[PDB]
Write a protein that binds this ligand. Structure first.
Ligand SMILES: */C=C\C(=O)Nc1cccc(Nc2nc(Nc3ccc(N4CCN(C)CC4)cc3)nc3ccc(F)cc23)c1
Length: 299
């Protein structure tokens, strides 16, 4: 019929890793920063540890099912699960948190190159999720994580298949339809979020009123930094006719083209001399034996 999913599900021992602090909590479950030390490998790998009704455990083993079945540079890396009283997912730690916060906090140091290259990196993320016939159904700036400033990854597959009203297509809102082309829409809102530096979309309109405002032809405005070239590309994602919207494959191409002359398509004051932390900086980075998950492959 179709192709067998021969992904592997690593079961880790609650002793093979240690929690360091908490990163955040607030949904009958918590995220720690920790370290995972494969028994006998002489490596230390930084992780995020996500963590008991009977429903709860089935819903998280489903997330894990899916993360287990992805490998892309722009899709959060799932390392394994640990079968404590509570099921917990061990994921590659993403140090700079999520992009939505990142752009608010560092607003005044983000250059057009950074914006355009995040835009590319998510088009790749999602073009891959499409390659894998996967529909995210909750792409937003909140659900992209920052490994380095130069490298972001998509996460929260709590909704992925094969509610956040202000992010979703028309046909989604009205007929519960979801496609890779429903996902292209949210890609467009997500990008508006970056261009506006973490502004809130439709800031003021209760989601009850959203659907009709769209039915009128009204959409999200043109970020000030945005040339018409970029804002045009936002807009094509927001056609009602979903086959007119662009393909992640074509979104990669178009942002990659702009990321050759970023100053020509995004206009930021003093865009010129804007630095963000970097892996070739001495600050960035005990710490003995530490490897990135993205360099720790099959045991
Ligand atoms: C924008 C939405 C949002 O807030 N996401 C979010 C908040 C807390 C925790 C997680 N999950 C998560 N976090 C991280 N890395 C992370 C979280 C928080 C912080 N800040 C920085 C400074 N102070 C100390 C407060 C904490 C930094 C870094 N990484 C991952 C990696 C994988 C994963 F599945 C979840 C994850 C999200």
């Amino acid at each position: 019929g179709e192709a067998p999913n021969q992904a592997l599900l690593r079961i880790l021992k609650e002793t093979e890793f240690k929690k360091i602090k908490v990163l955040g909590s607030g949904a009958f479950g918590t995220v720690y920063k920790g370290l995972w030390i494969p028994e006998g490998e002489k490596v230390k790998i930084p992780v995020a540890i996500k963590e008991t009704s009977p429903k709860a455990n089935k819903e998280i083993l489903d997330e894990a099912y899916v993360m287990a079945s992805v490998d892309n540079p722009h899709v959060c890396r799932l390392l394994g699960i640990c079968l404590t009283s509570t099921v917990q997912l061990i994921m590659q730690l993403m140090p700079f948190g999520c992009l939505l916060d990142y752009v608010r906090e560092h607003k005044d140091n983000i250059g057009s190159q950074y914006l355009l290259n995040w835009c590319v990196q998510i088009a790749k993320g999602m073009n891959y999720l499409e390659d894998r016939r996967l529909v995210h159904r909750d792409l937003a700036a909140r659900n992209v994580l920052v490994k380095t400033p130069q490298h972001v990854k998509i996460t929260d597959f709590g909704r992925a298949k094969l509610v956040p009203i202000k992010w979703m297509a028309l046909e989604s809102i009205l007929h519960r339809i979801y496609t890779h082309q429903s996902d292209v829409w949210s890609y467009g809102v997500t990008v508006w979020e970056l261009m506006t530096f973490g502004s809130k979309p439709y800031d003021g309109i209760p989601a009850s009123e959203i659907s009709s405002i769209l039915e009128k032809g009204e959409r999200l405005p043109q970020p000030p930094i945005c040339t018409i070239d970029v804002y045009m590309i936002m807009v094509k994602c927001w056609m009602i006719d979903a086959d007119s919207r662009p393909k992640f494959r074509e979104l990669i191409i178009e942002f990659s083209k702009m990321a050759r002359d970023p100053q020509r398509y995004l206009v930021i004051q003093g865009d010129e001399r804007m630095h963000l932390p970097s892996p070739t900086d001495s600050n960035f980075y005990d710490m003995d034996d530490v490897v990135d998950a993205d360099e720790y492959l099959i045991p």
